[PDB]
């Protein structure tokens, strides 16, 4: 007398994901408008304009010595922030211009703090763009308030 051996096995199924991913809208702040146009693009402007977050999006460390940033909000004094002559924005890096009044904190070369100034500028409409050595934009960045229309 005597028995055994056995041989068995099958299987498969399950479920993952819900069909897809994306899921859009969220949030809304001002009709923004970013337009980059070389190495340099500008992460994010605080419309607020509490500070101005600056992005690479090149592979090879960008030189700033001598870069500006025009900002040009509602009916006041444009002001271009030139950065100084000894910065180089690595690529892939990223830095932060907070405005001395943004309750910021000095931490170059990557937070950086605009004592000249008091503040990048507030209003509905705000208009950040980035000019390189010479008098060129490379990156823009505007940002419109969905406010009322003139009646």
């Known amino acids: ?10 299987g498969g199924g399950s479920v993952t994901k819900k069909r897809k991913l994306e899921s859009s809208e969220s949030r809304s702040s001002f009709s923004q ?3 980059t146009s070389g190495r340099v693009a500008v992460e994010e402007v605080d419309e ?5 977050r600056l992005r690479n999006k090149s592979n090879e460390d960008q030189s700033m010595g001598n870069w500006q940033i ?3 909000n509602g009916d006041d004094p444009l002001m271009t922030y030139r950065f100084p ?3 180089t924005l690595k690529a892939g890096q990223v830095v932060t211009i907070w405005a001395s009044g943004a309750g910021a904190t ?3 070369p990557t937070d950086l703090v605009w004592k000249a100034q008091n503040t ?15 008098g060129e934009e490379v990156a823009m960045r505007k940002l419109v ?3 009322p229309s003139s009646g």
């Open 1 to 10: 007398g005597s028995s055994g051996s056995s041989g068995q096995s099958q």
């Open 33 to 35: 408008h970013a337009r």
């Open 48 to 52: 607020e304009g509490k500070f101005v």
């Open 70 to 72: 025009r900002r040009q």
């Open 85 to 87: 002559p000894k910065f």
């Open 106 to 108: 000095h931490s170059p």
């Open 120 to 134: 990048w500028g507030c209003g509905s409409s705000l208009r950040t763009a980035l000019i390189n050595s010479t």
């Open 145 to 147: 308030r969905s406010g």
